[PDB]
Write a protein that binds this ligand. Structure first.
Ligand SMILES: [Mg+2]
Ligand SMILES: [Mg+2]
Ligand SMILES: [Mg+2]
Ligand SMILES: [Mg+2]
Ligand SMILES: [Mg+2]
Ligand SMILES: [Mg+2]
Ligand SMILES: [Mg+2]
Ligand SMILES: [Mg+2]
Ligand SMILES: [Mg+2]
Ligand SMILES: [Mg+2]
Ligand SMILES: [Mg+2]
Ligand SMILES: [Mg+2]
Ligand SMILES: [Mg+2]
Ligand SMILES: [Mg+2]
Ligand SMILES: [Mg+2]
Ligand SMILES: [Mg+2]
Ligand SMILES: [Mg+2]
Ligand SMILES: [Mg+2]
Ligand SMILES: [Mg+2]
Ligand SMILES: [Mg+2]
Ligand SMILES: [Mg+2]
Ligand SMILES: [Mg+2]
Ligand SMILES: [Mg+2]
Ligand SMILES: [Mg+2]
Ligand SMILES: [Mg+2]
Ligand SMILES: [Mg+2]
Ligand SMILES: [Mg+2]
Ligand SMILES: [Mg+2]
Ligand SMILES: [Mg+2]
Ligand SMILES: [Mg+2]
Ligand SMILES: [Mg+2]
Ligand SMILES: [Mg+2]
Ligand SMILES: [Mg+2]
Ligand SMILES: [Mg+2]
Ligand SMILES: [Mg+2]
Ligand SMILES: [Mg+2]
Ligand SMILES: [Mg+2]
Ligand SMILES: [Mg+2]
Ligand SMILES: [Mg+2]
Ligand SMILES: [Mg+2]
Ligand SMILES: [Mg+2]
Ligand SMILES: [Mg+2]
Ligand SMILES: [Mg+2]
Ligand SMILES: [Mg+2]
Ligand SMILES: [Mg+2]
Ligand SMILES: [Mg+2]
Ligand SMILES: [Mg+2]
Lengths: 211, 105, 58, 232, 159
RNA sequence: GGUUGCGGCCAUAUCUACCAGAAAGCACCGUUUCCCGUCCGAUCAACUGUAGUUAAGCUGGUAAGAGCCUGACCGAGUAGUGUAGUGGGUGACCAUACGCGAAACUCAGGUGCUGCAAUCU
RNA sequence: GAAGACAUUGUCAGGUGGGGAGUUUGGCUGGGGCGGCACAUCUGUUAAACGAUAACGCAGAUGUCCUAAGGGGGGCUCAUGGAGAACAGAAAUCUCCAGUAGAACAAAAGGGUAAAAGCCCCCUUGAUUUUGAUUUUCAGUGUGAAUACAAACCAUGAAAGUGUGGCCUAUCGAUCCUUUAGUCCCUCGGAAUUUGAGGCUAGAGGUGCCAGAAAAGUUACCACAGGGAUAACUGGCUUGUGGCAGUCAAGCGUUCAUAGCGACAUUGCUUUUUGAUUCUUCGAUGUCGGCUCUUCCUAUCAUACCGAAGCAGAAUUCGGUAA
RNA sequence: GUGAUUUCUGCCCAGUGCUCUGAAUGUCAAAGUGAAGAAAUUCAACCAAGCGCGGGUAAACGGCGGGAGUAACUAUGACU
RNA sequence: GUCGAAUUUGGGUAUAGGGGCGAAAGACUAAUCGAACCAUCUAGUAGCUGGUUCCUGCCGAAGUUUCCCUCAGGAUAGCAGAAGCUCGUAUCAGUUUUAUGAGGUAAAGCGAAUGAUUAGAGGUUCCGGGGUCGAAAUGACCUUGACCUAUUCUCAAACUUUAAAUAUGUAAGAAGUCCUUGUUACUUAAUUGAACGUGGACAUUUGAAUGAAGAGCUUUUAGUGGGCCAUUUUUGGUAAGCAGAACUGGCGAUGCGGGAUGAACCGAACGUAGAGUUAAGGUGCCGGAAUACACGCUCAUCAGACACCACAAAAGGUGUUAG
């Protein structure tokens, strides 16, 4: 069934997603994208590590599947299965075509083959949030996810807090006051604009000046 | 389609030149009639030795004719023609659309 | 044997050998296409100003 | 006839040997691994429906070691276009030969061969594919031209070869029954199964402008005003 | 096969803008056009009568005729090694005055006044528009404004 | 300045929820003989300004409002892109040189302007 | 002797007549055939923000349906959700609140439309007469479709106004022949009258191969003019597929990942496979296999010397130099 | 047409042919017959063979399948 | 093989070309047969192959548009030549600027409509169902999806509020601007307007830049209607020295210097000579020109050596060098 991954490597053809014109497409190989302890608060896992692509390429749906298992399998055995939260950012939507078949080219349009990603230079593929002490397991876990992909990707230690859009000290500036509150998985911050009636309903710690 | 048996339109005919009542029916061919210069020329050209001396049409495509209407102004009896689009069914007089009847039987 | 079907190569080169010229404006355009009711009057209007200058310059 | 054929193929079940099936505008394609599998199907089709066909071939390899030149075959089958319940004008010579039947006919059975019936003077006549294809014609009006009528009374006259036939049916139009007064009275083959107050379908020839030359070679006055195809 | 209808390829062109559907505003109808006026064409989608063909969208011509609810515009269209001269009969929703000609007309009154005033003043005019000349000298002060020294920054990731 | 008739541009004019309206005008509101329309004088029709109201409509005000509208050493001279080289790189792609230059995001302010006639403590 | 106004013979007329003659037996086309129609057209997209733009590119539609589903005016608000009403339930009818269209507008798709272009009523025939100008397709020819006027006659509405078919983009056809309406006007040429025939202006009967022949097969008995503009074999580019090699190592190998078996992924080389293409050769490069005989490659079956082993010995397995 | 001798040569006449001491008012040329008209002309009845209708013919051309059900299972070169 | 007969054979005689003869092979019929030979009609026709005869000078193409039983061909526009004619600073320009239009690609967006899509958190059950406590309840106690509330991960050739760059329409005056009061069967309640006018006023800073071997017009006729390549955008296809498009530059039709060699790359486009100077490329020897100068790197028991270009990858290395 499968052709080599060298064939459907580079972004040549236009985005060809599933719709009312394509209709029939095969199921995606990758299915669940979040792994580890995914019912965890923001204060638990500060240290964030990314897996960043350094090439404008396509990663197939089964390149991510083999990569996601090996990163999880190493991190579960060594550091324990509830010492992290792995997140696969990349979703495979692009449908690849194959000319599986009066003459040769006398009528030649291909059938759907499989789903693939469309990754760009500096894009994040895998995102992992963890404790401060448990870094070396995450760096070596993503190392073995790197062998399953083609091209060049690199691991980066994030300066941000967890999955937040905030730095190490900037989150600590606002979390000490009543300016941040937990959402569920992610987080909610105080806003100066909006109705003043429901800015007092939520955020009970702010508007006091004491503790 | 369906049309009324009568129509109220512009007669042109010296005494008329206004809107008047026209009777409506339907255009019917008219017979071939020998002694016409085509049929005199054709019957000469076929007679003798040499066989079929003209084309004979087979490859037909259409399925519906156009509808022509003889309008006869009831005052002057001045006839006047009028043409419609192609259609499979065609009648005239009554059989009018009602308010909102569902399918029956 | 198949052909080459269509192109527009060399067509813009051919075009400029002889200009691409404009169609020469004229003082007084044709009243072809103009409202009949207006022309009908304008005929009679100039007949009068010609006859007015003809009677003036007599 | 295709919808009938799709049902008939399943009962006896000649399909199985195909790799796959695709479709096209006016039919569908069947694909077979072996050549002898596709010939049984055409022999089966020859049995149950009127057809015309032919085969042509495409070459591929031509291996210089023998027993494998490797050809690929294509059989092009055409079903006869006159459906089961159509209204048909026959050609004049054809009509004289097959029993001296009238030119203005309904179809009957649409089996291996096509068979016609004359609704007024009950009569039957057959037409084999070989005799059809050599001089082809087409139906005057199809199933999509039927119109709803309401039967009032049936006066039987006599004959019954096999269907209790020649019923002088008095009928009136469904759009006419409510409003307007008009009645049509017509002899018909539908004698054994016709009852008063029943809705019947049929061709209503009085308001139809056809364009058939065969019909143009008819007797604009020996032709029946109303013909009823079936009960219901 | 191919399809070259009278309004093919006009999906977003004759569209009606966002939050500007419905009835056209009366100032459209109360504007008075005369023979000679320059007008830009832009087809309103709501009004189907008197419409232009997709070619004349964005073209600008002269008026030549005026009648009950329309104007005759006359455009130049190019074809081969040539320009032909084409005559339109558009309804007044699909048309509006060229503001470039209205800019010109006001400058004609300015220049006639300059010449009228120049004779009363005493000789010289110079009424042509000169393009942007190269700029003159100046002494930029450092009084409460000392130069701020800058240098190139080092690379940091932040991702 | 407020109202009324007719408007121009058609949310800085809307929406959610609250709050105030002297004058006059709008309004709700009372009647069914007549022209008129209804299953119904509810709507539309006529009559009365009489018996009564600012309780609604209407006008303005309020809200770290929703929306909408203008800016800003806000993001950003970034994304994107016209032209150049016997530039780099196995390729994918990436730098440099003459130029043009966004959107989301952010912050700050704003919450109808005006024409003709009439008419008002 | 027989036969006899029958036969026979002559002219015309119907039937039969591959026994014989003459002729024909579309095009596009990743060779040709089959299929398809890209052969006349329409929406979206390909299409790279003026216009134009190809492929047997992708997603689909057309040869109709309508006396209203046309013209004018009037009177209303739709999809859906929520709250209530005996039989009545997810679906019946009545009542209220919300509702920028999420409804509907004959059929493909894209625009358009809210005191409407939608739904319900009243009145109607402007889907009429005379002919010219203009737009699109373009040669600025025809065909089709449309735009705005003019000169008449009408419909509707209190009125301003609106109406020359279907809210808009598709829904169709020359010359010859036949026929119908008009003028009831011209001509039949020695002169007349009535039959008959011919003309002028406007429609209809049709050619979907849609700017428009009247048309079945076969050749393995074959011919001619040409074609490497084009197939069948060597060669070339390509390498999906085949073959060969790493990398990571799932399961195995009683304990034991890596002595050795070795799945799936991910990176390559080969031209000993087969596809894809049509550059060379059609005024000809002899188209299978075998026999015979030289030489070259190593990706080494044996033969020389070695290293590893889950190598006691024997018997093996794995790897290195080496053709 | 088949192809010495020996032993055989099955069922089938719907189809295409071939054929008939068979039915008769269905079709149907030219000449002639009547009617209508001033005449040129038009409209009717009549009508040969063949066609169509019905029998015969396979040592004429030829052809010689399927499908359900029969008190477990089994469905026959049976029976329906 | 056959060799006493369906035997072999001489002379005579008969059968003639759509004819003969044939114990049947399309066999034979004077080296001729799936229709003999000879002369004439006949210089039969060919959209197809081959050839087409002296020198120099000037100008110098096309493989594209529409229609054709059209696709190896014609008609038609186009590009080309020739002959001119009316005039003579002419108005124009494959260009910029100023002023002003048009567009839905790139990007962006989805805590905006449309369509896809990963996670939790808060709620709501008379309402898609199960379990727990049940005589039932428009009941509670647990739950998995549906929708609701603010959040969150990721997208769209045939989705979109916003929206570039490049490419594209018009204007920058004498055929113009202002006053004066005439003409009309059109238009207005109204000599008010409308369109063209008489008379008067305004001139070479006459109203942005740059340019202009002159500006305009007519007639007529050749060849061509197989193209191919390159940078960027691109559809088909796994790919191709593959198939199909978009703008520009080229080869074809073109030599000269450079890339050893080469249709298209880089430089540069040619009458006949002398002197100087350079381009792209080079300067050990072949080979005209520095075994120049300067700072470094690298040692290879397959070193490496100049765009297009004649290939190399994942993965490794206490080799050595900077961080
Ligand atoms: Mg004869
Ligand atoms: Mg060509
Ligand atoms: Mg084509
Ligand atoms: Mg219209
Ligand atoms: Mg009341
Ligand atoms: Mg009232
Ligand atoms: Mg109040
Ligand atoms: Mg606010
Ligand atoms: Mg015959
Ligand atoms: Mg014969
Ligand atoms: Mg013959
Ligand atoms: Mg062909
Ligand atoms: Mg074909
Ligand atoms: Mg375009
Ligand atoms: Mg309508
Ligand atoms: Mg005479
Ligand atoms: Mg016609
Ligand atoms: Mg015809
Ligand atoms: Mg033949
Ligand atoms: Mg053969
Ligand atoms: Mg033979
Ligand atoms: Mg021979
Ligand atoms: Mg070739
Ligand atoms: Mg040779
Ligand atoms: Mg040789
Ligand atoms: Mg070796
Ligand atoms: Mg026999
Ligand atoms: Mg024999
Ligand atoms: Mg039989
Ligand atoms: Mg028989
Ligand atoms: Mg028989
Ligand atoms: Mg018989
Ligand atoms: Mg011989
Ligand atoms: Mg000659
Ligand atoms: Mg030259
Ligand atoms: Mg033709
Ligand atoms: Mg040639
Ligand atoms: Mg577009
Ligand atoms: Mg984009
Ligand atoms: Mg797009
Ligand atoms: Mg051609
Ligand atoms: Mg080619
Ligand atoms: Mg050439
Ligand atoms: Mg050159
Ligand atoms: Mg080289
Ligand atoms: Mg260059
Ligand atoms: Mg030297």
């Amino acid at each position: 069934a499968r052709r080599p991954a060298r064939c459907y490597r580079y972004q040549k053809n236009k985005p060809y997603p599933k719709s009312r014109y394509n209709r029939a497409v095969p199921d995606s190989k990758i299915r669940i994208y979040d792994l580890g302890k995914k019912k965890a608060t923001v204060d638990e896992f500060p240290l964030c590590v990314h897996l960043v692509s350094n090439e404008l390429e396509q990663l197939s749906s089964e390149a991510l599947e083999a990569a996601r298992i090996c990163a999880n399998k190493y991190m579960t055995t060594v550091s324990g299965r509830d010492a992290f939260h792995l997140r696969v950012r990349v979703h495979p939507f692009h449908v690849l075509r194959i000319n599986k078949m009066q003459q040769g080219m006398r009528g030649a349009w291909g059938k759907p083959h499989g789903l693939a990603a469309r990754v760009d230079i500096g894009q994040i593929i895998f995102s992992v949030r963890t404790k401060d002490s448990n870094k070396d397991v995450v760096v070596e876990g993503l190392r073995r996810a790197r062998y399953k992909f083609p091209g060049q990707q690199k691991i980066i230690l994030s300066k941000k807090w967890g999955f937040t859009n905030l730095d190490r000290p900037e989150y600590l500036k606002k979390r000490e006051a009543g300016e941040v509150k937990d959402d569920g998985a992610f987080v909610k911050f105080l806003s100066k604009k909006g109705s003043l009636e429901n800015n007092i309903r939520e955020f009970p710690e702010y508007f006091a000046a004491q503790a | 389609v369906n049309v009324p048996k009568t129509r109220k339109t512009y007669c042109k005919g010296k005494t008329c030149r206004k809107h008047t009542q026209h009777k409506v029916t339907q255009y019917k061919a008219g017979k071939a009639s020998l002694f016409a210069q085509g049929k005199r020329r054709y019957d000469r050209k076929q007679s003798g030795f040499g066989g079929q001396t003209k084309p004979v049409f087979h490859k037909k495509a259409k399925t519906t004719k156009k509808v022509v209407l003889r309008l006869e102004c009831v005052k002057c009896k001045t006839r006047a023609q009028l043409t419609l689009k192609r259609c499979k069914h065609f009648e005239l007089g009554g059989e009018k659309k009602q308010k909102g009847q569902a399918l029956q039987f | 044997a198949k052909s080459k079907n269509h192109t527009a190569h060399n067509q813009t080169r051919k075009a400029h050998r002889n200009g691409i010229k404009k169609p020469k404006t004229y003082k007084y355009p044709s009243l072809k296409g103009v409202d009949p009711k207006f022309r009908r009057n304008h005929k009679h209007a100039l007949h009068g100003t010609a006859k007015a200058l003809a009677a003036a310059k007599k | 006839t295709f919808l009938f054929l799709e049902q008939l193929i399943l009962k006896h079940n000649a399909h199985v040997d195909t790799i796959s099936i695709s479709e096209a505008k006016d039919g569908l394609d069947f694909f077979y691994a072996q050549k002898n599998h596709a010939v049984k199907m055409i022999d089966f089709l020859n049995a149950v429906v009127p057809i015309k066909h032919k085969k042509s071939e495409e070459l591929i390899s031509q291996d210089t070691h023998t027993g494998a030149s490797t050809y690929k075959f294509s059989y092009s089958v055409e079903i006869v276009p006159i459906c089961k319940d159509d209204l048909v004008v026959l050609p004049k010579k054809l009509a004289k030969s097959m029993g001296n039947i009238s030119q203005f006919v309904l179809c009957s059975k649409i089996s291996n061969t096509v068979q016609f019936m004359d609704p007024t003077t009950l009569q039957t006549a057959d037409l084999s594919p070989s005799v059809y294809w050599r001089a082809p014609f087409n139906a005057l009006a199809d199933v999509t031209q039927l119109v709803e009528f309401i039967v009032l009374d049936v006066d039987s006259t006599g004959i019954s070869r096999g269907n209790r036939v020649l019923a002088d049916i008095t009928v009136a139009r469904t759009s006419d029954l409510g409003v307007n007064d008009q009645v049509y009275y017509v002899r018909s083959h539908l004698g054994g199964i016709c009852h008063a107050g029943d809705s019947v379908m049929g061709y209503f020839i009085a308001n139809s402008n056809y364009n058939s030359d065969l019909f143009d070679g008819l007797n604009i006055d020996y032709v029946p005003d109303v013909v009823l195809v079936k009960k219901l | 096969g191919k399809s070259h209808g009278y309004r093919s390829r006009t999906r977003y062109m004759f569209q009606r803008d966002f939050r500007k559907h419905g009835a056209v505003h009366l100032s459209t109808y109360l504007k008075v056009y005369k023979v000679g006026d320059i007008v830009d064409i832009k087809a309103n989608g709501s009004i189907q009568k008197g419409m232009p063909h997709k070619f004349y969208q964005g073209k600008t011509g002269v008026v030549y005729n005026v009648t009950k609810s329309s104007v005759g515009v006359i455009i130049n269209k190019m074809v081969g090694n040539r320009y032909l001269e084409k005559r339109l009969n558009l309804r007044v929703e699909h048309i509006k005055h060229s503001k470039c000609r209205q800019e010109f007309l006001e400058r004609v009154k300015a220049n006639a006044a300059k010449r009228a005033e120049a004779k009363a003043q005493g000789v010289a005019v110079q009424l042509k528009r000169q393009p942007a000349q190269p700029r003159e000298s100046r002494i930029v002060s450092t009084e409460g404004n000392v130069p701020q020294t800058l240098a190139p920054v080092p690379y940091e990731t932040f991702i």
